[PDB]
Every structure is written in structure tokens, then in C-alpha cells.
Amino acid sequence: GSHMRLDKFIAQQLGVSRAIAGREIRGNRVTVDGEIVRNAAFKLLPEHDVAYDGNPLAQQHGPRYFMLNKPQGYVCSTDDPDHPTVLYFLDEPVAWKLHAAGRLDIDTTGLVLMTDDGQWSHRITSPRHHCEKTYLVTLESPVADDTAEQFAKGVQLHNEKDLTKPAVLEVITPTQVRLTISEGRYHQVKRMFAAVGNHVVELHRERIGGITLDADLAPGEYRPLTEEEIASVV
Ligand SMILES: O=c1cc[nH]c(=O)[nH]1
Numbered sequence: 001g002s003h004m005r006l007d008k009f010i011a012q013q014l015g016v017s018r019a020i021a022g023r024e025i026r027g028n029r030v031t032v033d034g035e036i037v038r039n040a041a042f043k044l045l046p047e048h049d050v051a052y053d054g055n056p057l058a059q060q061h062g063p064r065y066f067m068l069n070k071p072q073g074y075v076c077s078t079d080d081p082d083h084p085t086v087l088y089f090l091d092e093p094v095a096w097k098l099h100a101a102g103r104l105d106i107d108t109t110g111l112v113l114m115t116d117d118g119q120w121s122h123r124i125t126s127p128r129h130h131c132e133k134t135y136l137v138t139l140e141s142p143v144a145d146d147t148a149e150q151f152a153k154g155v156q157l158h159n160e161k162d163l164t165k166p167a168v169l170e171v172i173t174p175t176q177v178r179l180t181i182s183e184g185r186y187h188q189v190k191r192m193f194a195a196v197g198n199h200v201v202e203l204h205r206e207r208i209g210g211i212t213l214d215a216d217l218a219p220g221e222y223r224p225l226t227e228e229e230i231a232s233v234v
Pocket residue numbers: 104105108184186187188189190191203
């Protein structure tokens with residue numbers, strides 16, 4: 001249930017201690033739905049209209065954060081009108097207000113963080129921030145023996161002045177590798193492999209900073225992030 005004591009809401013709104021919020025409430029300065037409320041423990045609901053000295057104090061919908069296992073065939077923005085967006089999978093009120101804190105291309109699958117918290121989102125996506133992202137990459141040809149070292153030194157993408165920052169590549173099978181990078185350049189993973197002479201056949205994101213995609217969240221499924229995960233997805 002979404003609810004909070006009136007004295008806590010007033011404290012928050014006026015930037016005052018809960019004790020003084022109580023003082024004000026008993027001072028007959030606080031109204032809810034037009035009537036005066038002198039009780040500090042009043043259970044404030046989302047549908048209540050609070051006012052302080054005649055002035056309205058709208059309540060604020062808390063921020064929302066979701067973990068989505070993105071499937072192929074859907075896009076993470078309305079930039080391209082030829083494909084349906086990932087909102088198709090979300091069944092949440094005013095879902096159009098949500099955006100991906102780190103977009104994935106149409107056929108790239110995996111972890112996408114849906115949120116309406118711009119600050120949180122920016123801390124994660126900013127090109128200036130070192131945020132690690134790990135991908136499960138399926139290759140056209142068996143990985144070369146020098147690729148891991150290449151990625152460690154950093155490679156040069158086709159027509160880019162500066163190399164890619166050091167990334168670590170773990171070989172699972174000859175054609176399936178796990179790659180961790182800390183950048184966010186456009187189509188970086190696919191271009192890094194093109195640069196060294198291979199081709200990405202399938203791309204799956206498993207982690208973003210401190211948040212790892214659940215092993216049992218099926219493609220298309222999603223869920224609210226826990227307080228711990230929100231607390232620091234890196
Ligand atoms: O990091 C990313 C995301 C999408 N495509 C890539 O090649 N790399």
C-alpha cells in the first residue's frame with residue numbers, strides 16, 4: 001500500500017522535522033480534501049489533496065524502475081517507426097513515461113532498465129561514466145587467439161580517432177564469448193569484432209553495473225527492481 005503519515009509528508013514538503021510538522025498540523029494549518037486535519041498520524045492516501053495555509057502541496061508519484069529481458073524484434077525508443085517498442089511487454093499505468101536507461105538494438109536481447117528517473121538514468125548512461133556492461137556474444141567464426149589481448153589493449157573501430165577502452169573477453173566455446181566493456185559507443189560490440197575480423201551473430205546483455213539479469217526471467221518478462229538493486233546498479 002502507498003501511504004504515509006501526514007506529519008511525515010508535511011515534514012518532507014516543508015523541509016522541517018517531523019516534530020515541527022506535528023506542531024503545524026495541530027496548529028490547524030494543514031488541510032486535506034478541504035477539511036482541517038489536526039492529527040499527525042493521519043494516514044495520507046494518494047487520492048488526498050493536501051494544503052498548507054491554503055496553498056496546495058501535491059503528492060509525488062515515487063520513481064519506478066524495472067528489469068526487462070528484452071526479446072528480438074522490438075526497439076527501445078520511438079525513433080524508428082517501423083518496429084513495435086518494448087512497451088508492448090509492459091502492463092503498467094502511463095507506461096509511455098518510461099524510458100530505457102541504456103538502449104538495445106532491435107535484435108539484441110537481454111537486460112534493459114526501464115525507468116522514469118532521469119537522474120538515476122543519466123548516472124548510468126552518461127558517456128563520461130565508467131559503467132560496466134557484460135554481454136554474451138555469439139560469433140560467426142571461432143574466436144581468434146589474439147582477440148582477448150587486442151580487446152585488452154583496446155582496438156580501433158572503423159573510422160574512430162581513439163581506441164576502445166580495455167575490455168575483458170572470457171571464452172566459453174570457440175564461437176560463444178562473454179565480453180565486459182565499460183563504454184557505450186554506438187554498436188560497439190559488433191564493431192569491435194568486425195574490427196578484428198569476425199562477425200557477431202547473436203548478442204545478449206547479462207549485466208549493467210551492479211544489476212544482473214535474472215536467470216529465470218523469460219524473454220519478454222520484466223519486474224520491478226528491488227530496493228537493493230535500485231540502491232546501486234553501479
Ligand atoms: O554495447 C553495445 C550495444 C549494442 N550493440 C553493440 O555492438 N554494443
